[PDB]
Amino acid sequence: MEIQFGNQRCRMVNSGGFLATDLKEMETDDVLVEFLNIEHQLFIRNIRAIVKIADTTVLPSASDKKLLYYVFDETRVRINDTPVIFSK
Amino acid sequence: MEIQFGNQRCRMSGGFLATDGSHLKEMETDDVLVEFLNIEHQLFIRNIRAIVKIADTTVLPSASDKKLLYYVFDETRVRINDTPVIFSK
């Protein structure tokens, strides 16, 4: 599927990756968020941003103890107050 | 704030559901079924060793270094090992 984050069109083709500001495989210190796609389920880990799924704020987490949140509302994900659209 | 799992009732921060389903343990032993978490007044479930459903969505199990946290978006349809879980005040 494709991730639209304001400006950005990004594709996600194999269970996920890291969202840079302007999908990367490695977690650099300039990536905002981590995506996982498995068995038709979408998960987001917050690294360095303000992240919302509907009314839920996604707590940031470190790479050795990741907190990956099931995206229970694929239509209300926000990152840094910018809407994210997923489309297959 | 109180969880009943089949016949057993327990109180809960958060914690780990024992195999029994009697109480919520503080540390993750290797016989506990699931983790309940309370984060900013919202209930989340991490599956460890059980078959867990929230409504029609399968709750995938996850290891502690990569937790998959499911917001309990339907409190009336939580099932663990095909056993209904009721949440009460």
Give the burial class of A67: count Cβ atoms within 10 A of its Cβ; 0-12 exposed, 13-18 middle, 19 or more buried.
Answer: buried
Query: B32: domain range?
Result: 1-89
End-to-end CA distance of chain B: 5
State the structure-solving technique: X-ray
Which residues 6+ apart lie within 8 Å of A54 measured at CB?
Answer: A72, A73, A76
Q: Is B89 helix (H, G, I), strand (E, B) or coil?
A: coil
Chain B residue set in contact with A, beta carbons under 8 Å: 39-40, 42, 57-58, 60, 62, 64-71, 73
Instruction: Encode burial over A21-60: b for 16+ CB neighbours within 10 A, e otherwise.
Output: eebeeeeeeebbbbbbbeeebbbbbbbebebbbeebebee
Q: In this structure, are residues A57 and A51 in contact, taking their beta carbons and an 8 Å threshold? A: yes
Half-sphere exposure of B41 (CA within 13 A, CB side): 1
End-to-end CA distance of chain A: 4
Which of B46, B71, B78 should one mutate to test binding to chain A, selecting the residue with the greatest count of A CBs within 10 A? B71
Q: Return the closest-CA partner of residue B48 out of B56, B40, B36.
A: B36
Q: State the total domains in chain A.
A: 1
Q: Is the dihedral of CA A49, B27, B41, B50 positive or negative?
A: positive
Which of A44, A68, A76 should one mutate to test binding to chain B, selecting the residue with the greatest count of B CBs within 10 A? A68
**Chain centroid offset of residue B3 CA:** 9
Q: Return the closest-CA partner of residue B69 out of B37, B40, B41.
A: B37
With left for phi above 0 and alpha for psi between -120 and 50, is residue A74 left, alpha or beta?
alpha
